[PDB]
Design a protein around this ligand. Structure first.
Ligand SMILES: NC(=O)c1ccc[n+]([C@@H]2O[C@H](COP(=O)([O-])OP(=O)(O)OC[C@H]3O[C@@H](n4cnc5c(N)ncnc54)[C@H](O)[C@@H]3O)[C@@H](O)[C@H]2O)c1
Ligand SMILES: NC(=O)c1ccc[n+]([C@@H]2O[C@H](COP(=O)([O-])OP(=O)(O)OC[C@H]3O[C@@H](n4cnc5c(N)ncnc54)[C@H](O)[C@@H]3O)[C@@H](O)[C@H]2O)c1
Ligand SMILES: O=C(O)[C@]1(O)C[C@@H](O)[C@@H](O)[C@H](O)C1
Ligand SMILES: O=C(O)[C@]1(O)C[C@@H](O)[C@@H](O)[C@H](O)C1
Lengths: 282, 282
């Protein structure tokens, strides 16, 4: 029943649901678990370099870390080993620390989004998909999409260069032209012709109300996904559901990234329903 | 029910019972608790400076640390505040870390030994006591003795200068000549005339079998204490008990230092019997 020590290195972490998910699941499996925010905007860790914080976790007996913005790319060269997916994406969100201090990076944003597709869109047609948004989250989402059956992914971002950089990284990772950058302007016509669309922008959040594109381009035959998890039913997903579309809400990725990280950190098989219930309770 | 994160910085920590005591008591009070060894002889922390390790604990959300050999003196100048007792002794074994990272040093070896006297020797005559051993543990024990009613303490060590240094520190701390260094050679005659004697040497441990002085100097009217806690009944305490002496075993200090540290770390009132039972179970 050895206790488990985890943390999350990033900025602006107060509202994260990840600590609670891991603390509750460890306890449910008979292992007292501490999961600390390590917030470089906060009083404890501000001003410290990522390496200092990583090294600190090694010295003081952490079993694992998650890594979030702005450190998911910066962390790679600091680690002893990086999984093939995280290496090719160039982004790590999960660091397993061995008993004796060795670090291995993984990306459970990718695996978590993919699991969400399996769990919540098992029958979705995947030939042609549009993703709007090529930021940090979007990079993992795109990789997940094209490794879980999407034949052609068109990625749009207001910053065309972000979309093109994403496409290059993912296509190299998978070894085919799976992703094409397309203009954000006129994206509705591209979506109208596709099988599905995923929002990977902040649109739909309380501080970013609305949608990333005009929802009148949707049809009843589309499926629609959203990375936003608060609210769970974004304006986009409401519009999709009104037409009878299958929808994939952002909680699936948010929960499954933690399920998969917990498994990697501990070697235990997480109970998905318990972790989901923790997430929804917050 | 916020989780609690603690650790112990020192060398050669595998057999410490302190982590288990704190982990169990936190859990018993409804707070998942991790207490990590931070062992500078081990794979995680070896080669690191004390300041690096202290700073690490601040950054990564520790609520407290214990400090053991060889760092109890070295830690003082690294802390924001130090209690008056720990300051005057020049040794800290407990560091409370505030929510926002401020450190306060305390010495619960002193308070713990004193509590052990109250708990286990409530009726002991304290006019004249001999202590054999003026190492690290001995410094706290001597301070506890003379602040919990001992009028004259004679301290002997094979290294006379250690005993004399101890006497100077304690006498300055209390503001009277409470302690006198005396020769180890011939200590039996000094003990014979005293009310009680405390072993603060390694003698009695499995790897240091025997006693620090010839037990034929004891009488039925003496009380006898020992800092050794494994075995609980040292050869010294066996000899004392055979005469009908009251005895103070080393587990009292070992438990109470943790009781008092837990209170300081958490603001919760520890259950002494639960912590004692954890200690004895290991
Ligand atoms: N479900 C989860 O597990 C999870 C985890 C973290 C974040 N998120 C969500 O993901 C969202 C995106 O996070 P991020 O870190 O990638 O943000 P980001 O700001 O780094 O990237 C968002 C991208 O969207 C683009 N964009 C904004 N409006 C657009 C529009 N109308 N058309 C095309 N592109 C547009 C921006 O140019 C930017 O590159 C967050 O706001 C958050 O709501 C979800
Ligand atoms: N009960 C507790 O909470 C607790 C905690 C830690 C250690 N301990 C015990 O305390 C013991 C002492 O620890 P320490 O760190 O002070 O050790 P230390 O080696 O630093 O000090 C022991 C001192 O005893 C002296 N000594 C040895 N034999 C002697 C003798 N025959 N006569 C006079 N002096 C003699 C040595 O010269 C030395 O200065 C440990 O061996 C351990 O068993 C108890
Ligand atoms: O829940 C969060 O705050 C996270 O930062 C979200 C996402 O970035 C994950 O990859 C991290 O493991 C946890
Ligand atoms: O139990 C231990 O290992 C300790 O190191 C014993 C003693 O040195 C105490 O002061 C520490 O708090 C804990």
């Amino acid at each position: 029943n050895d206790s488990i020590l985890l943390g999350l290195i990033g900025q602006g972490l107060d509202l994260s649901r990840t600590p609670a998910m891991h603390e509750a699941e460890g306890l449910a499996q008979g292992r007292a678990t501490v999961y600390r925010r390590i917030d470089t905007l906060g009083s404890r860790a501000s001003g410290q370099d990522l390496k200092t914080l990583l090294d600190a976790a090694l010295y003081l007996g952490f079993n694992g870390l998650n890594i979030t913005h702005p450190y998911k790319q910066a962390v790679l060269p600091l680690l002893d080993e990086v999984s093939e997916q995280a290496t090719q994406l160039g982004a790590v969100n999960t660091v397993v620390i061995d008993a004796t201090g060795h670090t291995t990076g993984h990306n459970t944003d990718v695996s978590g989004f993919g699991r969400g597709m399996e769990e919540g869109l098992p029958n979705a047609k995947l030939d042609s998909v549009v993703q709007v948004g090529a930021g940090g989250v979007g990079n993992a989402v795109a990789y997940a999409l094209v490794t879980h059956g999407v034949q052609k992914l068109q990625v749009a971002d207001l910053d065309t260069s972000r979309a093109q950089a994403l496409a290059d990284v993912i296509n190299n990772a998978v070894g085919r032209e799976a992703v094409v950058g397309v203009d954000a302007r006129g994206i509705e016509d591209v979506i109208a012709a596709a099988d599905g669309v995923v929002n990977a922008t902040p649109m739909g959040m309380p501080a970013h109300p609305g949608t990333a594109f005009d929802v009148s381009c949707l049809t009843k035959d589309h499926w629609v996904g959203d990375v936003v998890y608060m609210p769970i039913e974004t304006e986009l997903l409401k519009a999709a559901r009104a037409l009878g579309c299958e929808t994939l809400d952002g909680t699936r990725m948010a929960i499954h990234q933690a399920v998969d990280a917990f498994r990697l950190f501990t070697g235990l098989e997480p109970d998905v329903s318990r972790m989901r219930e923790t997430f929804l309770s917050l």
